[PDB]
RNA sequence: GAAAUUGGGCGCAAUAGAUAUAGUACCGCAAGGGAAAGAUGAAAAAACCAAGCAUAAUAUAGCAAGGACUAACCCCUAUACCUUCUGCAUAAUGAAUUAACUAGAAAUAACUUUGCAAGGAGAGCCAAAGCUAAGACCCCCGAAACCAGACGA
C-alpha cells in the first residue's frame, strides 16, 4: 500500500536534464558462476552482450567477477551512492539485456 | 514427519510486513493481520477510482470558487469554454485558478463574452451575423 | 519407421493425398521418433504408394 | 519461533561411494545375459514384494497369505484389522464409482 | 406472460411530416445503416442479447455498418430500443483502394474519404 | 525406481497403542467431541495418510525399450566423443597412478567406465589398478546399463564386448513375439 | 460391486448382469424385454411381437454394465455355431 | 598436451604427398575411403604428422579425401574462457576477474 | 542423422540433463490452494461429499436396470462351449509366402504356433484352429494341413491346389502339449495319448465330407469328388506328384506329435528319448 | 467363490519414531487406563527472532484501514472472517493468541507420451490396429448403540 510505504517527490540528481544529460549509473557488478545452471544466461550474456553494452555507454564501468556463486547477481551502483542489487538467477539472455538496460536507464 | 515445513517464518513475514503500522494486535498476530492486510489491499485497489473521483470533484470545487470570484458560475464557465473550442480540462483550469489568475480571469472574460454572444445570438433569431468569438474552426 | 528427412516425406504425402481428398491433409511429423501422422484412413493407399517408391 | 538460529553441519556426499558408483549394475542381466535371470530376482526386500507392485490392500492381502503364518500375533491381528478397514474403505467409500 | 412482441407495419410507414422532420427520401433511400448500441442488453430478454451479438454490437457506443435490407431490418426491429440507427451518407464517393486508409467516419454520419487534420 | 522398496511405515490410528474409550462424555463437558485419545488430531494419535508398510515400486518396461535404451546410450556416448574402444584391457602395471595419468593424458574425463567381456577373464593388471579407485570402474559386459553410462564421463569398451553388444542388442530387433520365456530351450537362441 | 476382493484383490463381476445381458464385442449389450412371458393372454399380438425381441441398451446402460463386469467378459469368443457371431464386429459406421 | 590446432600453410601438398605415399590417379581428392586399411594408414599418418586426430564422431563422416582435407583445415582452438574473454579486445570499462 | 551432428557441440548427457517426453507426465492434482481444494472436488455436504454413495447400479430405491430384466441364457454354458481360433487362407498364404510356415512339411498345430501365425490358448477353452474361407481365391499353395474344424469351401480351396486337409481332435491337455511342447518336455512327464472326441463330436470326426481323422479312408475320394463337382475344378490326383509321401502321412489318434509316440520321455538336456519296455506300460500307452 | 492344471533404508529425530527416560509417576475398589521430559564445552580438576509484557498509558469519531497529506489524528471512502443458506454486518455457527501437529489413499474403461506392430507381452493375457509400459481421479474428526470376555456387593 501507500500508507505503509514511504513516499517522495519527483526529482532528479543534479538537475539532470538542464545543461547536459549525465548517465546516472556508475558501476555494474556481475558475479557469474563458471559451472552452474543458475548463471547460464548470465554466461551467455557475458559471451555475447556485455561487450556491446559496455561500448554503447562508456560512462559505466563493469565488473564481471566470475566466482563460484550459487545465485548470480548484478549490482547497479549509482552516482548518488544508491546501490540496487538485483538477481539474474535463471534468466535468459534477452531478459538480462532488458534488465541491465532497465538499470542503465533509471537513476 | 517426513517433510514438514521449514520456510514458514518467511510466509508469516510476507504478510506481517504490511501490518507494521496497524493498531492493536493487528501488527503482531498473524491470524488478525491476514484479515486486516487483505482488507487493506482491497481498499487500496478500490481507492484508485475514488482517487480519480475525488481529484475531479476537488477541481470542480476550485474552478467553482475561482469562477465565483469573477462573477461567473461553474456551468457557464465550462460550457462556454467548450463553445470556444478552448478544450482545457479541469486540472489545468484549477491550476490556472491557483497559480496564474490573470489567465483565469481572461478565460473568464472569454467564457462570459461567449455566453453573452450566445444570449444575443439566441435573442435575435433568424439570420444575423455571428459573434466574433462564436465562430468555429472547421477541421478536415 | 521413417529414417532420414521426414519433412520431404511430409511434403510428398502432402503432394500425394491432396488429389485423393481435394484439401491438403493435416499431418504431424514427429521428427524425434521419426514418424508422420496423417489424418484419415489412408493405409492401403500408402502401402501401395510406398511399394511403388521401392521401399 | 520454529526455525534454527545456526546453519546445520555440512552434508558431505561421496558420489563415488561403492554403492553409488556401481549402482544399477546388472539391471540388464536378462537382456544381455541370455535371459538366464530376470531382474526381479535382483531386488532384495520383503519376501512378499520381491518383483511385485500392488496398492496397500493388495500388499496386505499378499503379506498375510505369504508370510502371515509366521507373523507375530498382534502384527497378525493389526494386519487383519487393516485388511478389514481397507476392504470397507476401497469397496464402499469413495467418490468415483 | 411477458413474451416476444410483434410490431404492426403501420408503425414502420413514414409520413411526410416525418419525411420533412428527418432528412430522408422515400424515393431513392439510403444503402447502409450506422447502428450504435446505446442501451445495455442486461435486464433484457435472451433473444435481444442474441440479436445484439448477431449484429456485432457487443461494445456500446461503437458504430457498425449494416445493409438496409428487410432481413437486417427485421433484426433491427427486434432490438430497436437498444440501438441508434442513422443512414450512412457519403459526401464524396465510397473509397477506392487509394483512399482506403485515409478515411474517418464523422459523428454526423458521413464517411469522409480524405481526412486531413488541418483547418480550412 | 524398480529396485526401490521404501521401508517407511507409520502407525495408523488403529495400530497406535491404547486409546479405546471416549475420554469424556459426548455432551456433558463443554470440550470438543472426541472418540479416542489416539485419533489423528491428538498429540500421540495415529497418522491419517502416512506411508504404509514396505512398498515396492516394481515395474518392467518392455525389453525392447531397455535394449533400445542401451542402443541410445551407445550412440550418445559415441557422438559426444566419449566412446573409446580398446582391443584388450591389459595394462603394463597394476598401479592406479599409471591409469589415472593415462586417462589425464588422453583427456578422457574425470570418470571412466572400463567394460570387459566376463568377470572371470578380466586381466589381473586392470583389476589391481581399478580396485583401488573410486572413479574408474570395471564392469563385465553383462552388467552394462544406462545409469552407470550416464554417471561416468567416458565409457571404454573392448572389441569382444562390442561384438557381444551387437549380438545382444541386434537380436532384439528382428526377433519374434515369444511363446514362452527365453531361458527355456529354443531352436537357435543359445 | 467389489472393486478389490479379499482373496485375490481383483474386481468382481455382478453375476446378475451376466445372467441377463449379452456383451457383444463392439460394446453393445443385448437384453430381453421385461415381461415377455407374463400375462400374454391380455396382450395384443403386436405387443407380443415387441416383447419377443433382443434389444440393445443405452450408452449409459452399456457403461454401467461394462463397469460391473471384468475383462473376461470383454473378450473375443470364437464359438462353433454361435447365433450372435455375426453381430460382434460393427460394420460400416461413419461415427 | 594441447587441443589447439593450426592448419599448415602447406597442408594441401603434404596431404597429397601422403596419398601418394599410400598409393596416384587424377582427382586425388575424390578417392573413396571405403577400404579400412587405406583409411587407417592415411588418417594414421595425418594424425601422426599434424598432432591432431579425427574424433570418433567424425570418423565415418569422411568417405572421400575431400572431406579429410575439409576436416584438417579448420582451426580448432582450446583456451580457457578467462583467456577467451579478456583477449577479445575488451573496451576499457570491462574488468573481468576469475576466482579460479 | 543431423541430430548426432547437433550432439557434437552440445554438452555431455548426464543424470542432470534428463527430461521426460513432454506430454508424458501430467501434473499431479492435489487439494491445496484456492481452486483445487476448498470443498476439494466433492461438492456440497450431502452423501457424496461424505463419501458414502451406494453401490454401482443402485438407482435410489426403484428396482435397478440390471434387475428389472428377465434372466435369459445368453451366457449359460459359456465355459463349456468350444472355441476355435480362425485361420483364414489369406493368413496362411501370408505365412507360407514369408517362410514362417513351411509347406514342404506337414502343417501340424505345432507348426502354426511356432510360426506364430496363430496364437491359441488352451486355457480360455480354445480347442484349436478352425479353417476359414477368407481369401479362398488367390490361394496358391500345395500344403498338408491338420486343422480341427474346416468349412467346405476352405477344404475345396485347399484341395483344388493339390492339398490335403484332415480334421483332428485334441483334448485341452493334449492341445496344451501341442501349442507349447517345449515347456512340456521340461515337465518330466511321459508323452500322453490324445483322447477321442466326446459323443457330440464323434459324428463330426468320422465323416469323410468334413475329413475326420477317424473316418473311412475308403470314402475320401468320393468326398473329394463331391467337392470337385460342387466348386468346378478338375480334381488332381495326389498319387502322381513327388510330395505325395509327405502329403500322405497322418499321425494316428492317440498320438500327439508327428514322429514321437505316447509314453516316451524326452530328455532335452542330453538330447535323448527314454522309451519304456515294460509290457503293462505298452498295454497302457499303445491302447 | 474354488479346483483339476501350472510352476539394509528417496525410515523418524524429542508434539516425530515404541506408550516408554516407564507400563514408572498418577488415576481407579478392581479389571483397567496412562503421562510429561533432555540439549555447554576437547576439558566444568576451566546476542538477532513467536505470542506476552517492559523500555514508552491516554486526547473528539466510530471493523480500526485506505486515498492521501507539510503533518500521527482531524478530511473523504469503507456493513470483520469462515461455514451454512434464497439471502448474514447480522443480534446464526466457530474462533483469546502464539508455536508445533492436524484432513483425497485406487480400479477396469477412456486420454497423453514412448516401444513394437497383424501382432503385442520376460509363458498364463489381449488383438477386425492392436498390445505393452508410464503419467494422471477418489478425505478428516464426532454418537447414542450391539455383541464377546473379564472386573466390581
Ligand atoms: Mg483401538
Ligand atoms: Mg466454551
Ligand atoms: Mg506416534
Ligand atoms: Mg451408507
Ligand atoms: Mg419402494
Ligand atoms: Mg492349484
Ligand atoms: Mg515420545
Ligand atoms: Mg507418549
Ligand atoms: Mg516479541
Ligand atoms: Mg470515517
Ligand atoms: Mg447486506
Ligand atoms: Mg449447521
Ligand atoms: Mg455487536
Ligand atoms: Mg456472529
Ligand atoms: Mg464463542
Ligand atoms: Mg456389604
Give, to the nearest 10 degrees, the angle between helix F63-79 and helix I2-9.
Answer: 60
Method: cryo-EM
Residues of H whose CB is below 8 A from I7: 57
What is the SS3 assignment for H86? coil
What is the SS3 assignment for A59? coil
What is the SS3 assignment for A26? strand
The count of other CB atoms within 10 Å of the CB of residue B99 is 9
Is the residue at I21 inside a domain?
no
Give the F:I interface size as CB pairs under 8 Å. Answer: 37
Q: CA B41, B46, B47: angle at the middle one, nearest 5? A: 95
CA distance I109 to I11: 55
Answer whether C18's CB lies under 8 Å from C24's CB. yes
Answer whether E27's CB lies under 8 Å from E61's CB. no
Q: CA I115, I116, I121: angle at the middle one, nearest 5? A: 130
Answer whether B62's CB lies under 8 Å from B48's CB. no
Count of all residues that appear for chain D in the document: 97
Q: What is the 3-state secondary structure (H, E, C) of chain B?
A: CCCCCCCHHHHHHHHHCCCCCCCCCCCCCHHHHHHHHHHHHHHHHHHHHHHHHHHHHHHHHHHHHHHHCCCCCHHHHHHHHHCCCCCCCHHHHHHHHHHCHHHHHHHHHHHHHHHHHHHHHHHCCCCCCCCCCCCCCCEC
For chain E, the distance separating the N- and C-terminal CA atoms, rounded to the nearest angstrom, is 59
Answer whether B80's CB lies under 8 Å from B118's CB. yes
Q: How distant is C1' of J142 from CA of D90, in Å?
A: 22
F113 forms beta bridges with F137, F155
Enter the C-alpha cell of residue C35.
Answer: 514418424
Q: Residue I86: which of B36, A7, E49, G85 has the closest Cα?
A: G85
Task: Give D36 to chain F, closest Cα distance, Å.
Answer: 5
Domain hosting B28: range is 1-140
Quote the number of domains for chain B: 1
Which of A47, A55, A63 lies at the smallest CB-CB distance from H95?
Answer: A63
The count of other CB atoms within 10 Å of the CB of residue E116 is 11
For chain A, the distance separating the N- and C-terminal CA atoms, rounded to the nearest angstrom, is 23
Quote the number of domains for chain A: 1
G56 forms beta bridges with G30
DSSP letter string, F116-173:
ES-SSS--HHHHHHHTT-SSEEEEEGGG--SHHHHHSSEEEEEHHHHHHHHHHHHHHS
CA distance I254 to I196: 8
> In this structure, what CATH number is given to the domain that contains residue F149?
3.40.1370.10
What is the SS3 assignment for A34? coil
What is the SS3 assignment for I265? strand
Residues of H whose CB is below 8 A from A47: 85
CA distance F60 to E64: 65
Answer whether A100's CB lies under 8 Å from A42's CB. no
Domain hosting F106: range is 1-190
CA distance B117 to B127: 14
Is the residue at I8 inside a domain?
no
Is the residue at I213 inside a domain?
yes
CA distance E11 to E33: 19
CA distance C44 to C25: 16
> In this structure, what CATH number is given to the domain that contains residue A11?
3.40.30.10
Q: Taking the CA of residue C42 as centre, how many other CA atoms within 13 Å lie in the half-sphere pointing to its CB?
A: 19
Task: Please give the helix or strand (H or E) that residue A86 lies within, else none.
Answer: strand A83-87
Q: Residue I7: which of A35, F75, H80, F112 has the closest Cα?
A: F75
Is the residue at I65 inside a domain?
no
Sort strands F136-140 and F112-116 into parallel, antiparallel or unpaired. Answer: parallel
Q: Cα(F43) to centroid of ligand 3, in Å?
A: 8
- Sequence-distant (≥ 6) Cβ neighbours of residue F84 within 8 angstroms: F108, F154, F155, F156, F157, H56
Nucleotides in chain J with any atom closer than 7 Å to protein CB: 1-2, 4-13, 15-19, 23, 33-36, 48-52, 63-69, 71, 76-78, 80-81, 83-85, 97-109, 112-129, 132-144
Enter the C-alpha cell of residue E106.
Answer: 464523422
Cα-based torsion angle of the residue sequence F28, F34, F38, F44 in order, rounded to the nearest 10 degrees = -90
Reported resolution, Å: 3.1
Strands (E), G1-95: 22-23, 29-32, 54-56
Count of all residues that appear for chain B in the document: 140
From residue H60, alpha-carbon distances to F164, F166, H11, H65, I269 in Å are 22, 18, 21, 12, 46
Q: Most H CBs within 10 Å: which of F79, F87, F155, F159, as the mutation test of the H interface?
A: F79
Q: How distant is C1' of J37 from CA of F50, in Å?
A: 26
- Sequence-distant (≥ 6) Cβ neighbours of residue C42 within 8 angstroms: C17, C20, C25
CA distance F148 to H91: 46
Task: Give I24 to chain G, closest Cα distance, Å.
Answer: 26
E66 forms beta bridges with E33
If you measure CA to C1', which residue is closest to nucleotide J134? Answer: I24
Quote the number of domains for chain I: 1
Q: How distant is C1' of J131 from CA of D22, in Å?
A: 35
Count of all residues that appear for chain C in the document: 55
CA distance E26 to E42: 35
Q: How distant is C1' of J76 from CA of B64, in Å?
A: 19
Enter the C-alpha cell of residue E56.
Answer: 456485432
Answer whether G57's CB lies under 8 Å from G31's CB. yes
Q: CA F133, F137, F142: angle at the middle one, nearest 5? A: 155
Subunits adjacent to chain C (3 or more Cβ pairs under 8 Å): none
Q: Where do the domains of chain E lie?
A: 1-120
Enter the C-alpha cell of residue D17.
Answer: 561411494
Task: Give H18 to chain F, closest Cα distance, Å.
Answer: 25
Subunits adjacent to chain I (3 or more Cβ pairs under 8 Å): D, F, G, H
CA distance G69 to G59: 16
What is the SS3 assignment for I273? strand
Answer whether A98's CB lies under 8 Å from A49's CB. no
Q: What is the largest CA-CA distance in chain E?
A: 59
Amino acid at each position: 500500500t501507500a500508507r505503509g510505504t514511504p513516499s517522495r517527490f519527483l526529482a532528479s540528481v543534479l538537475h539532470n536534464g538542464l545543461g547536459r544529460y549525465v548517465q546516472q549509473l556508475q558501476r555494474l557488478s556481475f558475479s557469474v558462476s563458471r559451472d552452474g545452471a543458475s548463471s547460464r544466461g548470465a554466461r551467455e550474456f557475458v559471451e555475447r552482450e556485455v561487450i556491446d553494452f559496455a561500448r554503447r555507454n562508456p560512462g559505466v564501468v563493469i565488473y564481471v567477477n566470475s566466482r563460484p556463486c550459487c545465485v548470480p547477481r548484478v549490482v547497479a551502483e549509482y552516482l548518488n551512492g544508491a546501490v540496487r542489487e538485483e538477481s539474474i538467477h535463471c534468466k535468459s539472455v534477452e531478459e538480462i539485456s532488458t534488465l541491465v538496460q532497465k538499470l542503465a536507464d533509471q537513476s | 514427519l517426513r517433510n514438514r515445513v521449514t520456510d514458514r517464518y518467511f510466509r508469516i513475514q510476507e504478510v506481517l510486513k504490511h501490518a507494521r503500522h496497524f493498531r492493536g494486535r493487528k501488527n503482531r498476530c498473524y491470524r488478525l493481520a491476514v484479515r486486516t492486510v487483505i482488507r487493506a489491499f482491497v481498499k487500496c485497489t478500490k481507492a484508485r477510482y475514488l482517487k480519480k473521483k475525488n481529484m475531479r470533484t476537488l477541481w470542480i470545487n476550485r474552478i467553482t470558487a475561482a469562477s465565483q470570484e469573477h462573477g461567473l458560475k461553474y456551468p457557464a464557465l465550462i460550457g462556454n469554454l467548450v463553445k470556444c473550442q478552448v478544450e482545457l480540462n479541469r486540472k489545468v483550469l484549477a491550476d490556472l485558478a491557483i497559480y496564474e489568475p490573470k489567465t483565469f480571469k481572461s478565460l473568464a472574460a472569454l467564457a462570459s463574452r461567449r455566453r453573452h454572444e450566445g444570449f444575443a445570438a439566441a435573442l435575435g433569431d433568424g439570420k444575423e451575423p455571428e459573434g466574433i468569438f462564436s465562430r468555429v474552426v472547421q477541421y478536415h | 519407421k521413417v529414417e532420414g528427412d521426414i519433412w520431404a516425406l511430409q511434403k510428398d504425402v502432402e503432394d500425394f493425398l491432396s488429389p485423393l481428398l481435394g484439401k491438403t491433409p493435416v499431418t504431424q511429423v514427429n521428427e524425434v521418433t521419426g514418424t508422420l501422422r496423417i489424418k484419415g484412413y489412408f493405409d492401403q493407399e500408402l502401402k501401395a504408394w510406398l511399394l511403388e517408391k521401392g521401399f | 519461533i520454529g526455525i534454527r538460529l545456526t546453519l546445520p553441519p555440512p552434508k558431505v556426499v561421496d558420489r563415488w561411494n561403492e554403492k553409488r558408483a556401481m549402482f544399477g549394475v546388472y539391471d540388464n542381466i536378462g537382456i544381455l545375459g541370455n535371459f538366464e535371470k530376470h531382474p526381479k530376482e535382483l531386488i532384495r526386500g520383503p519376501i512378499w514384494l520381491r518383483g511385485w507392485k500392488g496398492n496397500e490392500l493388495q500388499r496386505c492381502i499378499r503379506k498375510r497369505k505369504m508370510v502371515g503364518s509366521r507373523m507375530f500375533a498382534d502384527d497378525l491381528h493389526n494386519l487383519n484389522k487393516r485388511i478389514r478397514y481397507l476392504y470397507k474403505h476401497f469397496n464402499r467409500h469413495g467418490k468415483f464409482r | 406472460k411477458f413474451t416476444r412482441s410483434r410490431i404492426p407495419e403501420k408503425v414502420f410507414q413514414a409520413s411526410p411530416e416525418d419525411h420533412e422532420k428527418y432528412g430522408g427520401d422515400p424515393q431513392n433511400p439510403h444503402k447502409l445503416h450506422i447502428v450504435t448500441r446505446i442501451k445495455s442488453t442486461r435486464r433484457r430478454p435472451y433473444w435481444e442479447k442474441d440479436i445484439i451479438k448477431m449484429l456485432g454490437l457487443e461494445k456500446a457506443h461503437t458504430p457498425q455498418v449494416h445493409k438496409n435490407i428487410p432481413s437486417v431490418n427485421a433484426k433491427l426491429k427486434v432490438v430497436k430500443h437498444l440501438i441508434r440507427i442513422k443512414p450512412l451518407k457519403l459526401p464524396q464517393g465510397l473509397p477506392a483502394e487509394e483512399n482506403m486508409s485515409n478515411t474517418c467516419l464523422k459523428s454526423t454520419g458521413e464517411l469522409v474519404v480524405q481526412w486531413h487534420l488541418k483547418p480550412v | 525406481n524398480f529396485k526401490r522398496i521404501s521401508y517407511a511405515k507409520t502407525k495408523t490410528r488403529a495400530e497406535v497403542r491404547g486409546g479405546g474409550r471416549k475420554p469424556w462424555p459426548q455432551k456433558g463437558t463443554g470440550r470438543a467431541r472426541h472418540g479416542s485419545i489416539r485419533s489423528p488430531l491428538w498429540r500421540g494419535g495415529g497418522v491419517a495418510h502416512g506411508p504404509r508398510g514396505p512398498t515396492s515400486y516394481y515395474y518392467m518396461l518392455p525389453m525392447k525399450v531397455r535394449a533400445l535404451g542401451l542402443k541410445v546410450a551407445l550412440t550418445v556416448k559415441l557422438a559426444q566423443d566419449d566412446l573409446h574402444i580398446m582391443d584388450s584391457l591389459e595394462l603394463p602395471t597394476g598401479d592406479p597412478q599409471y591409469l589415472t595419468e593415462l586417462a589425464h593424458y588422453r583427456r578422457w574425463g574425470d570418470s571412466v567406465l572400463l567394460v570387459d567381456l566376463t568377470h572371470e577373464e578380466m586381466p589381473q593388471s586392470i583389476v589391481e589398478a581399478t580396485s583401488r579407485l573410486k572413479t574408474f570402474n570395471l564392469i563385465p559386459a553383462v552388467g552394462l546399463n544406462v545409469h552407470s553410462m550416464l554417471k561416468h564421463q567416458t565409457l571404454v569398451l573392448t572389441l569382444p564386448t562390442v561384438a557381444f553388444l551387437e549380438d545382444k542388442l541386434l537380436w532384439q530387433d528382428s526377433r519374434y513375439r515369444p511363446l514362452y520365456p527365453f531361458s527355456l530351450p529354443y531352436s537357435d537362441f543359445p | 460391486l467389489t472393486y478389490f476382493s479379499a482373496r485375490k484383490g481383483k474386481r468382481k463381476t455382478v453375476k446378475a448382469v451376466i445372467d441377463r445381458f449379452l456383451r457383444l464385442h463392439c460394446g453393445l449389450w443385448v437384453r430381453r424385454k421385461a415381461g415377455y412371458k407374463k400375462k400374454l393372454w391380455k396382450k395384443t399380438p403386436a405387443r407380443k411381437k415387441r416383447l419377443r425381441e433382443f434389444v440393445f441398451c443405452n450408452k449409459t446402460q452399456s457403461k454401467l454394465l461394462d463397469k460391473m463386469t471384468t475383462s473376461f467378459w470383454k473378450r473375443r469368443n470364437w464359438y462353433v455355431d454361435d447365433p450372435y457371431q455375426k453381430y460382434h464386429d460393427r460394420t460400416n459406421l461413419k461415427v | 598436451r594441447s587441443r589447439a590446432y593450426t592448419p599448415p600453410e602447406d597442408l594441401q601438398s603434404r596431404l597429397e604427398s601422403y596419398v601418394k605415399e599410400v598409393f596416384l590417379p587424377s582427382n586425388w581428392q575424390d578417392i573413396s575411403l571405403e577400404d579400412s586399411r587405406l583409411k587407417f594408414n592415411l588418417l594414421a599418418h595425418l594424425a601422426d604428422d599434424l598432432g591432431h586426430v579425427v574424433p570418433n564422431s567424425r570418423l565415418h563422416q569422411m568417405c572421400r579425401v575431400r572431406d579429410v582435407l575439409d576436416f584438417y583445415n579448420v582451426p580448432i582452438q582450446d583456451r580457457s574462457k578467462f583467456d577467451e574473454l579478456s583477449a577479445s579486445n575488451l573496451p576499457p570499462n570491462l574488468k573481468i576477474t576469475w576466482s579460479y | 542423422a543431423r541430430a548426432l551432428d547437433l550432439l557434437r557441440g552440445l554438452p555431455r548427457v548426464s543424470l542432470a540433463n534428463l527430461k521426460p517426453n513432454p506430454g508424458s507426465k501430467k501434473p499431479e492434482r492435489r487439494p491445496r490452494g484456492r481452486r483445487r481444494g476448498r470443498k476439494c472436488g466433492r461438492g456440497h455436504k450431502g452423501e457424496r461429499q461424505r463419501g458414502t454413495r451406494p453401490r454401482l447400479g443402485f438407482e435410489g430405491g426403484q428396482t435397478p436396470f440390471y434387475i428389472r430384466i428377465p434372466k435369459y441364457g445368453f451366457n449359460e454354458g459359456h465355459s463349456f462351449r468350444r472355441q476355435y481360433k480362425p485361420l483364414s487362407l489369406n493368413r496362411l498364404q501370408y505365412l507360407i509366402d514369408l517362410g514362417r510356415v513351411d509347406p514342404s512339411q506337414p502343417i501340424d498345430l505345432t507348426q502354426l504356433v511356432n510360426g506364430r501365425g496363430v496364437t491359441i490358448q488352451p486355457l480360455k477353452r480354445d480347442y484349436g484352429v478352425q479353417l476359414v474361407e477368407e481369401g479362398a481365391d488367390t490361394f496358391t499353395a500345395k500344403v498338408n494341413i491338420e486343422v480341427q474344424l474346416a468349412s467346405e469351401l476352405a477344404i475345396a480351396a485347399i484341395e483344388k491346389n493339390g492339398g490335403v486337409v484332415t480334421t483332428a481332435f485334441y483334448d485341452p491337455r493334449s492341445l496344451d502339449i501341442v501349442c507349447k511342447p517345449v515347456p512340456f518336455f521340461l515337465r518330466g512327464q511321459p508323452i500322453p495319448k490324445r483322447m477321442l472326441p466326446p459323443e457330440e463330436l464323434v459324428p463330426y470326426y468320422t465323416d469323410a465330407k468334413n475329413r475326420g481323422y477317424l473316418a473311412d479312408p475308403a470314402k475320401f475320394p468320393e468326398a473329394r469328388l463331391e467337392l470337385a463337382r460342387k466348386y468346378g475344378y478338375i480334381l488332381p490326383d495326389i498319387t502322381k506328384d513327388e510330395l505325395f509321401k509327405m502329403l500322405c502321412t497322418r499321425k494316428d489318434p492317440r498320438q500327439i506329435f508327428f514322429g514321437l509316440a505316447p509314453g516316451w520321455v524326452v530328455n532335452m538336456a542330453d538330447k535323448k528319448i527314454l522309451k519304456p519296455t515294460d509290457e503293462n506300460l505298452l498295454k497302457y500307452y499303445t491302447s
